[PDB]
Amino acid sequence: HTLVWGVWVNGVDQGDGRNIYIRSPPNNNPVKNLTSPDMTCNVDNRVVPKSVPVNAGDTLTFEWYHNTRDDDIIASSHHGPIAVYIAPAASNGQGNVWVKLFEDAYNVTNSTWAVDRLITAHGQHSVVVPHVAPGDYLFRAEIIALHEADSLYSQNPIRGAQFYISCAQITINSSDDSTPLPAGVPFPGAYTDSTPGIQFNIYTTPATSYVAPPPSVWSGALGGSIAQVGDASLE
Ligand SMILES: OC[C@H]1O[C@@H](O[C@H]2[C@H](O)[C@@H](O)[C@H](O[C@H]3[C@H](O)[C@@H](O)[C@H](O)O[C@@H]3CO)O[C@@H]2CO)[C@H](O)[C@@H](O)[C@@H]1O
Ligand SMILES: OC[C@H]1O[C@@H](O[C@H]2[C@H](O)[C@@H](O)[C@H](O)O[C@@H]2CO)[C@H](O)[C@@H](O)[C@@H]1O
Numbered sequence: 001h002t003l004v005w006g007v008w009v010n011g012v013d014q015g016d017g018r019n020i021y022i023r024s025p026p027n028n029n030p031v032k033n034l035t036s037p038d039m040t041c042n043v044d045n046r047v048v049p050k051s052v053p054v055n056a057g058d059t060l061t062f063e064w065y066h067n068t069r070d071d072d073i074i075a076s077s078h079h080g081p082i083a084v085y086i087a088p089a090a091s092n093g094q095g096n097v098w099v100k101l102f103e104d105a106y107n108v109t110n111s112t113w114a115v116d117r118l119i120t121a122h123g124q125h126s127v128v129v130p131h132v133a134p135g136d137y138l139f140r141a142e143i144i145a146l147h148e149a150d151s152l153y154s155q156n157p158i159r160g161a162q163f164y165i166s167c168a169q170i171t172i173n174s175s176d177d178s179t180p181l182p183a184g185v186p187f188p189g190a191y192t193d194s195t196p197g198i199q200f201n202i203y204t205t206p207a208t209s210y211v212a213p214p215p216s217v218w219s220g221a222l223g224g225s226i227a228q229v230g231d232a233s234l235e
């Protein structure tokens with residue numbers, strides 16, 4: 001159970017974005033039905049009044065929290081990967097539009113899941129804004145908690161992979177468009193019961209064998225991190 005509080009741009013806090021520039025759901029419960037319309041941008045996908053201005057090459061940091069800002073972030077049980085996707089905003093996240101900018105699943109070097117590192121990072125993970133066409137975008141940050149993913153939700157709706165999905169409205173102002181955004185995948189639709197990384201038993205299957213759900217990270221993506229970029233406690 002986790003939500004996005006807001007974003008930072010080049011280490012500058014853009015302030016509380018909930019229901020303002022984040023398409024916030026009413027609560028931190030997960031989405032679990034892979035064919036749900038809720039897979040796009042969680043259960044309350046609608047235009048919110050603001051979009052955060054960025055330029056190509058800016059560091060864009062998502063900040064998650066559990067109950068209050070800069071708390072436990074997400075229950076430690078919720079091991080799993082983190083991904084960020086981008087789609088043009090006029091799509092409203094519909095159709096073949098979502099392009100993956102970031103993936104971090106299990107780090108063999110550190111012996112930690114992305115979620116484990118997200119907690120240590122006070123809920124902060126970042127991407128480099130890509131060199132796409134100037135305009136309005138949705139950045140879809142997705143945490144998959146795998147602690148009940150040994151079952152398919154479609155088998156047993158009390159369990160399944162858990163999707164914590166948050167869509168931020170971002171406006172890309174200055175961009176040379178050196179990497180035009182291609183068509184991408186649909187949500188719902190990209191993940192199915194047979195997709196690698198959706199059904200996974202973390203109790204019996206080593207995390208060294210985990211394969212995150214496709215799609216692969218786009219060739220235009222410039223990278224990211226899971227690391228504290230801003231200190232919320234200084235405000
Ligand atoms: O035993 C089932 C699994 O429970 C996980 O804890 C979650 C609880 O089941 C869930 O009810 C609770 O939901 C809270 C939420 O955390 C809180 O922010 C909100 O204000 O109220 C909700 C309703 O009470 O969330 C926790 C996760 O934080 C365990 O983490 C898991 O190990 C266990 O298998
Ligand atoms: O960040 C580690 C993460 O990498 C995943 O592979 C990506 C990589 O992140 C990205 O830089 C490159 O552009 O594409 C590949 C393929 O999608 C990998 O799938 C994860 O297991 C790993 O934790």
Ligand SMILES: [Cl-]
Nearest residue numbers: 001030075162
């Ligand atoms: Cl939970």
Ligand SMILES: [Cl-]
Nearest residue numbers: 003042165166
């Ligand atoms: Cl959310």
Ligand SMILES: [Cu+2]
Nearest residue numbers: 001002075078
């Ligand atoms: Cu939870």
